[PDB]
């Protein structure tokens, strides 16, 4: 049974926040994985991208730990990436899943040409960088699928993008940097100021303001 500690957890459990997008709107940090499990528990899938043994040299021998990369996300609008290093592989995978759940970001999807049907590709050309690895997503026509390497393809399918062109530069052999770069490119999709978002924003009430009294008495 989940007993929330943060204010956001109490509001989410108490049936006050109705959607994860209300949390995304105010850029609130999510520190309890039970929030993600509560909002998208049914549709979430995980996929262990890589297990890498890292070694620290010591006076007698090499102390070996294991680093797990886990990509999570319902195949519609949401995706997350998590990296966890531990002494046991199973513990590392569990921690990486928790971290991937904590890192779920929304994905903005657009159209290539005509705006008929649901959005299917990235709104515009986006770029992510992580340590000499540059990943570029390009909008693609309907039905083209994902033209990318396997590692970015997993995350792109997991986010919900149906069609996408991809160009990668750098040392993509490092799976961690490749995954973090494509994750960064995905995350940038809702930070691009396109003309359709030029309309002046109407500010609403934050959950901490809307439910101040309920938090006071709970």
């Amino acid at each position: 049974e989940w007993m929330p500690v943060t204010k956001l957890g109490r509001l989410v459990k108490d049936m006050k926040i109705k959607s994860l997008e209300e949390i995304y709107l105010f850029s609130l940090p999510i520190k309890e994985s039970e929030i993600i499990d509560f909002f998208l528990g049914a549709s979430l899938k995980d996929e262990v991208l890589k297990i890498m043994p890292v070694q620290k040299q010591t006076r007698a021998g090499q102390r070996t730990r294991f680093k797990a990369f886990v990509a999570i996300g319902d195949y519609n609008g949401h995706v997350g990436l998590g990296v966890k290093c531990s002494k046991e592989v199973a513990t590392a995978i569990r921690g990486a899943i928790i971290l991937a759940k904590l890192s779920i970001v929304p994905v903005r999807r657009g159209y290539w040409g005509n705006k008929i049907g649901k959005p299917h590709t990235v709104p515009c050309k986006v770029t992510g960088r992580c340590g000499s690895v540059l990943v570029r997503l390009i909008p693609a026509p309907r039905g083209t699928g994902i033209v990318s390497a396997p590692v970015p393809k997993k995350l792109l399918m997991m986010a919900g993008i149906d069609d996408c062109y991809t160009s990668a530069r750098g040392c993509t052999a490092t799976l961690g940097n490749f995954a973090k770069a494509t994750f960064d490119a995905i995350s940038k999709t809702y930070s691009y100021l396109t003309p359709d978002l030029w309309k002046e924003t109407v500010f609403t009430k934050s959950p901490y303001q809307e439910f101040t009294d309920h938090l006071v008495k709970t």
Binding site: V48, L49, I51, P53, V89
Partner: peptide
Amino acid sequence: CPEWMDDFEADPKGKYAQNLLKKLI
């Protein structure tokens, strides 16, 4: 398989490490 994780953790750098890592993912 838990047996795969065990056989990998016994020898993280060995004759069978690559196969067990591929199995884990």
